[PDB]
Design a protein around this ligand. Structure first.
Ligand code: MG
Ligand code: MG
Ligand code: MG
Ligand code: MG
Ligand code: MG
Ligand code: MG
Ligand code: MG
Ligand code: MG
Ligand code: MG
Ligand code: MG
Ligand code: MG
Ligand code: MG
Ligand code: MG
Ligand code: MG
Ligand code: MG
Ligand code: MG
Ligand code: MG
Ligand code: MG
Ligand code: MG
Ligand code: MG
Ligand code: MG
Ligand code: MG
Ligand code: MG
Ligand code: MG
Ligand code: MG
Ligand code: MG
Ligand code: MG
Ligand code: MG
Ligand code: MG
Ligand code: MG
Ligand code: MG
Lengths: 361, 47
RNA sequence: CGCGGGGUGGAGCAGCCUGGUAGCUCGUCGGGCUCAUAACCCGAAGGUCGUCGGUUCAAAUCCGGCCCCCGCAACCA
RNA sequence: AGCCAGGAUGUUGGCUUAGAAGCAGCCAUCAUUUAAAGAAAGCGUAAUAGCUCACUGGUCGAGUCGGCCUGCGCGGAAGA
RNA sequence: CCAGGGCUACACACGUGCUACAAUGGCGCAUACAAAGAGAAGCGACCUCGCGAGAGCAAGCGGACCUCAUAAAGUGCGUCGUAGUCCGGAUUGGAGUCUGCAACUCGACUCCAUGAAGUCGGAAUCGCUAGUAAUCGUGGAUCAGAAUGCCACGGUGAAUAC
RNA sequence: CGGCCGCAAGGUUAAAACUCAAAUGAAUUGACGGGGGCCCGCACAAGCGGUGGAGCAUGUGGUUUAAUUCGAUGCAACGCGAAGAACCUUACCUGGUCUUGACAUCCACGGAAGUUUUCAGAGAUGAGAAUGUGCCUUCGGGAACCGUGAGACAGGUGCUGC
RNA sequence: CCCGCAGAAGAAGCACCGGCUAACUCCGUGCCAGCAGCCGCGGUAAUACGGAGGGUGCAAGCGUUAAUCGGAAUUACUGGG
């Protein structure tokens, strides 16, 4: 028919998922309820509420006001060339060409919303893939799931770097660590944390029967340059006193010992090893430098442990995709995308398993 | 609703720690014919 | 801050003392052996010797500074 | 130096067409109505609103103001 | 339904084959000795042209009469005399023939030139005891053209089994 | 654990909670043994000639790619299906297109079929420009072919050798 | 307790259906959700899951837990090794 007009029905294909997910009718209808909330004289007495809302109304704009104009252009961009192809108006033929860029850039305005989820989207990330027990079949599938994403990362233009590796005793691997390098590395693979599921007839067992083996693929950026010891002497109360006393008249007179008490925290750091106050100062400053940074490593782990506590209670909800190769069927159990193209999946056909997975997530 | 796994504390990884839980153990299907496909009575024993 | 030794492939040790071409076991990689793995047999690759500077025909080597590691010392009051 | 008037015009001026609208990081320094007005010196309010100074006239009407070179002082200066 | 590309891609590795490392050999000339098989929009002698692959003309035969199609090793004479040699044959450049709408990715063959690796082959491993092994040549199925593969026939013809 | 005994090591008397739905005995049919007896095959021994080394043909795993079609992938896959990928094959990839359709039966309507040539395009197709008319006693249609149309369906080298 | 009403009028549910143990097949879910007393069923043709059709077992009562005994001659004197 027309590659120009079918492209419009393909922008429609990208639009309808966003129409159904965020509910652009109810997402629109939410705005008029908060217009009357904001249109009020007694909203000045809660300025924090209005400041939280004054941009919240604008957050609803770029979602609704983009889609509200987007539905109008579907008939408009298609109907422009439809009248231009009849009269063969070559200028009007070229007029609808820029019209194809009208809604697509608006769709790109929603692409901001697609990548809005995240604070390290453009950061480089790691691809850590651990294998389940499963005998050797799970060892092989970790390798089969390695090259699943290793073929895909190079299929899109991302730099693939293999940092760590651990091979199988018989065949396959055990736990490989790939570092995907480039911009938007962690952004696309953010929806890849979670266990993957394989169902196939295992070739490793002699009487080969259908094994249901699993593999997990946890990703994380691990990119930082900010380390704060907070050795600022506005803190760190210094207390100097004299030792126990074994060296006669001298050590009982010299205030050699020293204590380092942190002002915000309260941990004390004493040192009375050497004989000079100048020498015990640097050692007590060193031990305080250790005990303060090691307190920071526990608060890093405390927030990390509470982060896992929202993940350990999930259980059988950490499964991502079901690769049932006995009947040649793929099941993304999160969203509900079924595909019958397992030979093409291993090439890295997961673009269908991202557009459905990431925008809805 | 909340799955009780068999490890008290969890450190550094959630999804990977659950991978070594008996929830995600290997499931081997007992074949209908061949090796390890003998049954006393099976599913309906009428002779 | 003192004194002595050390930093050599992925690991552990040689060689430095008295300068030129860096070695051994394990590991890694490829191929055989076996139904398959381990092991075994065979072949090959891999380190400018912590870093910088100086001297020298030539620096892993001799000297110096710094960073790092270990041991000793850190005393009479 | 005081006491009396104005202190405007487009301009809610382009942020990226969430909010500083003479006022956070925004840019740049326009031309006219002209005794006179900087798209700005401060306070202020999510923002505005509002009150003064910049600059200019009337008026009681004379010297006055800002630096530099220097003599001698002042504050900084709390112990048994 | 349709055109072009791809199944022929290329740092690597393996399996199965062909051809050699030479003198029981290569090359030059003359030349002896077979079986089976295929053939009609098919195979297509004699003759002429060409260094050739073939081109032109063109009977015979759908068949023990015709064509494919001089079988090659072998034999005799001569030469090279043990070197990367006249061993070996890949690769590439230039010039052509056939088939086919079409030979570029991607054909077969010929011609001229070029002419690498390879000098008896690590661990290890395979086939075979009679006209077998080894070694040489021809045909057919497939097919417009396109094999060292497959299938099949024939020539020469061992060694050892205590 | 407590009691008795012992120099000690321990001996003796002797539970429960919890957990599984089997533990065990003799015998029987097979398979297996680095068990025995007997026997066979190129299995070994005795030998000849090859493979792995070198170039090339072909297939495969990989890697790559828009795609490198799918399948075979210990022995018993790897010159395998393919007795032959320049188009075709072809199922693959990109792009261009048609959908009750390239192939099939039924129905109504309009026309014998069929032949020649031009324009646009990579082609599929679209638009035309000339021409003709075979069988019966239905002859206002049956028998053939072309075209449009809706409804049944057509189609699949799509999945499962589990 | 006995007589009268243009009146069937006011009165039927509950488990189970693989075997033990009377009683069969289709849809929906695909080792997930669930069933259970025991053996064990569910891995895309389930009579064992869920829901319907029928079928059975009982019935103003059924079904499930709980307790004792029986089956248990698995405490055996009757009656074992
Ligand atoms: Mg030396
Ligand atoms: Mg190895
Ligand atoms: Mg030097
Ligand atoms: Mg003054
Ligand atoms: Mg002073
Ligand atoms: Mg004073
Ligand atoms: Mg084609
Ligand atoms: Mg193939
Ligand atoms: Mg080729
Ligand atoms: Mg001779
Ligand atoms: Mg001639
Ligand atoms: Mg000729
Ligand atoms: Mg030659
Ligand atoms: Mg030549
Ligand atoms: Mg040898
Ligand atoms: Mg032929
Ligand atoms: Mg034959
Ligand atoms: Mg005692
Ligand atoms: Mg005891
Ligand atoms: Mg006998
Ligand atoms: Mg198949
Ligand atoms: Mg073969
Ligand atoms: Mg298409
Ligand atoms: Mg007619
Ligand atoms: Mg016609
Ligand atoms: Mg079978
Ligand atoms: Mg009645
Ligand atoms: Mg039940
Ligand atoms: Mg049922
Ligand atoms: Mg009882
Ligand atoms: Mg008894």
């Amino acid at each position: 028919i027309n590659p120009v007009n079918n492209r419009i029905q393909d922008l429609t294909e990208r639009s309808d998922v966003l129409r159904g997910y965020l509910d652009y009718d109810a997402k629109k209808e939410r705005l008029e309820e908060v217009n009357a909330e904001l249109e009020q004289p007694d909203v000045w007495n809660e300025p924090e509420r209005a400041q939280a809302l004054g941009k919240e109304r604008s957050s609803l704009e770029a979602v609704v006001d983009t889609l509200d104009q987007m539905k109008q252009g579907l008939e408009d961009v298609s109907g422009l060339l439809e009248l231009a192809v009849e009269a063969d108006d070559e200028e009007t033929f070229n007029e609808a060409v820029a019209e194809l860029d009208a809604l697509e850039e608006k769709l790109a305005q929603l692409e901001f919303r697609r990548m809005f989820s995240g604070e390290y989207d453009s950061a480089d990330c790691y691809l850590d893939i651990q294998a389940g027990s499963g005998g050797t079949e799970a060892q092989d599938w970790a390798s089969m799931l390695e090259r699943m994403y290793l073929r895909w990362a190079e299929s899109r233009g991302f730099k693939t770097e293999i940092i760590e590796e651990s091979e199988g005793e018989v065949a396959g691997i055990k736990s490989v660590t790939i570092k995907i390098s480039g911009d938007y590395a962690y952004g696309w693979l953010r929806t890849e944390t979670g266990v993957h599921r394989l169902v196939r007839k295992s070739p490793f067992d002699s009487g080969g029967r259908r094994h249901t083996s699993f593999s997990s693929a946890f990703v994380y950026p691990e990119v930082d340059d900010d380390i704060d010891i907070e050795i600022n002497p506005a803190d760190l109360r210094i207390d100097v006193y004299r030792t126990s006393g074994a060296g006669g008249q001298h050590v009982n007179r010299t205030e050699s010992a020293v204590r380092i008490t942190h002002i915000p925290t309260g941990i004390v750091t004493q040192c009375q090893n050497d004989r000079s106050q100048h020498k015990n100062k640097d050692q007590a400053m060193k031990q305080m430098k250790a005990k303060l940074y090691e307190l920071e490593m526990q608060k890093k782990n405390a927030e990390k442990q509470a982060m896992e506590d929202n993940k350990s209670d999930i259980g059988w909800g950490s499964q991502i995709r079901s690769y049932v190769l006995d009947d040649s069927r793929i099941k993304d159990l999160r969203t509900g995308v079924e595909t019958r193209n397992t030979q093409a999946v291993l090439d890295g056909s997961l673009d269908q398993f991202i557009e459905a997975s990431l925008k809805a997530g | 609703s909340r799955y009780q796994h068999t490890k008290g504390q969890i450190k550094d990884n959630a999804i990977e720690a659950l991978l070594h839980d008996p929830l995600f153990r290997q499931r081997v299907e007992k074949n209908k014919k061949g090796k390890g496909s003998y049954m006393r009575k099976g599913k309906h024993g009428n002779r």
